[PDB]
């Protein structure tokens, strides 16, 4: 019954997820701890997601504040759980993606794991993505293995679907190796648009999206990106799908209401997920939705209707809160590293084969 | 009787040292292998040593080339020694420093250890300084503990003096715990000056230096830099001692012949060493010189003259070739990581205490 911490901080930059798990015969969630991202740090992370000056100095100092916050949250969670650091075997830390360039064969995650070990007094397993990339893979997604271990079922063809900043799906097909790929944007554009407009961080329950009307021509134009055509191992991020990208599409088209664009963005996510998922697993019987997109009532409804042959529900029904799936997954990967068990799925990432993912920074 | 690889590429940027050692009852050098740094790569690393644009993307691509070259070298050495990589327990990789800012509490060594593990098929231990910096230390020097393991003679006092781009000394005073610090510039300015003048990489045997004559006024002004005044834990780099820095001193005084300036730079190194060393260890009886500075005949004689109470010889006289000392140290630090033994020295670095240095990237 070794206990592990998982630290995830996704591209939505909403905040830091910290989970505690017990890894026995099955993965149990013991506790969760959410740290909202400070305004300043969120914006400084966003400033590192595009090319710019003095990045090495800037990232180091952003890194220091990120780790300091992570260690604060870990300390908080342990005290509130009446357990010491000694009772935790290791922290699994994803870090923070500031650049993802699989075409150029690199992915950049910050989160100085040495400093995280020093501050927490706990062994840290981190930097899980770079060995997969080194093995020719996309480096993303890395949860499918975990999704397999949780929800691997012979009797059903399940698709486990994360909807964070970006969407990604794990295809659990009886008989066949685990498949998976980034579907496209999840909340990233819906958040970015309501931020450029107005100045909010996200659209609660997708209520602003539901107030507007879809523009079918715009939808067509957005779906005409090369990434949606591509199949098999692929990944994406803020490099491709961002506000500039959207504005470039809005330029050639005429002027539309802002809510209609938001509605179009919701549909863009629903349709990209639906069509890419159903292309890969037309036999799908259950879509299990995790990540913060699970809480979007407008989005979830649309997925159910665009995939009528499937039962679309969040992972809550199956015992695991959708908020903490990624955090639990990286806790699990620290386990996998310490037992020398493969981290990646080759037919997900496109790597040469299975690889032990991560590096060990001991306390 | 495990075998380790040591990989070191210092601030001189002359090339990559690859050593193979055995760590039985003591450290034995089995083989060495030097890789001249390609011109293109040397200049791109140098371009990352000052603030600039698009550093994260640039550093990543430079990193891949660095690692590709390191892996090539490792392959070449093993084949030439008729060895499988199965027979090597791990590689200790220093990586390549492109920024050293202890004051801002960060230091940046590139060398994607995950890719290095991928390409060599051997477990990599890397990223040694960061944990010392995390512990409130300078992060440099890191060799003193090795120096103590090799040349820890209690009957006699002695200082082990590495002269690379930068000079650093390990003070081995019988009974008293190990101390050390960066003395200042070793070859870095002498290299930088002749490069600026003639394009050459270094001054062979200090012949150019030896053809010129020391200028008193310039020397005084060079010795005036505050770094030389400071005592105890120190570290420095190209951030302080560089050609721009030198030219601030040149401009102040009238024009000098180029060779006289070179003569003066040789004197600057010897005096900053000799005075910092004996200040901290006045009883010094022996100066074991390692690093490429040991090959500078003019420098070695001048060190002898300034320190006549002690013998000044290279480490070759006591078993170890002066070129491979650092490479051997990092292989040793791999051994020290894997046994969970401290690799830093608080009374050298200023860190809160003894720490395991490095991170394990398994093959
Ligand atoms: N009640 C909600 N209604 C709609 N969207 C929501 C709601 N709560 C959270 N979200 C979305 O979930 C996102 C966070 O999802 P998350 O899984 O943390 O993504 P990431 O891992 O990329 O940070 C927010 O940016 C937001 O768009
Ligand atoms: N024959 C020589 N004569 C004088 N200086 C030399 C000679 N060979 C090497 N050097 C000096 O040694 C330096 C390399 O020393 P090294 O120990 O590799 O330092 P670093 O760790 O900074 O790379 C060169 O830059 C040069 O100044
Ligand atoms: C941050 C950094 O890169 N420091 C190095 C450091 O290198 C050696 C390996 C050490 O860690 O002890 C040393 O202080 C000095 C002289 O050694 P070399 O120039 O021969 O490498 O160089 C640089 O300051
Ligand atoms: C490079 C990167 O950070 N990718 C993220 C991102 O956010 C969701 C999706 O794109 C996924 O591929 C991945 O995160 C999850 C945890 C994963 O690796 O499965």
UniProtKB/Swiss-Prot annotation, chains A, B:
Domain of life: Bacteria
A GO molecular function held by the record: phosphotransferase activity, alcohol group as acceptor
InterPro entries per the UniProt record, alphabetical: Anhydro_N_Ac-Mur_kinase (IPR005338), ATPase_NBD (IPR043129)
Functional pathway: Amino-sugar metabolism; 1,6-anhydro-N-acetylmuramate degradation; Cell wall biogenesis; peptidoglycan recycling
Transferase is among the record's keywords: yes
CDD domains: ASKHA_NBD_ANMK (cd24050)
Role according to the record: Catalyzes the specific phosphorylation of 1,6-anhydro-N-acetylmuramic acid (anhMurNAc) with the simultaneous cleavage of the 1,6-anhydro ring, generating MurNAc-6-P. Is required for the utilization of anhMurNAc either imported from the medium or derived from its own cell wall murein, and thus plays a role in cell wall recycling. Contributes to intrinsic fosfomycin resistance in P.aeruginosa.
Family: Belongs to the anhydro-N-acetylmuramic acid kinase family.
Name of the protein this chain belongs to: Anhydro-N-acetylmuramic acid kinase
Organism field: Pseudomonas aeruginosa (strain ATCC 15692 / DSM 22644 / CIP 104116 / JCM 14847 / LMG 12228 / 1C / PRS 101 / PAO1)
Gene assigned in the entry: anmK
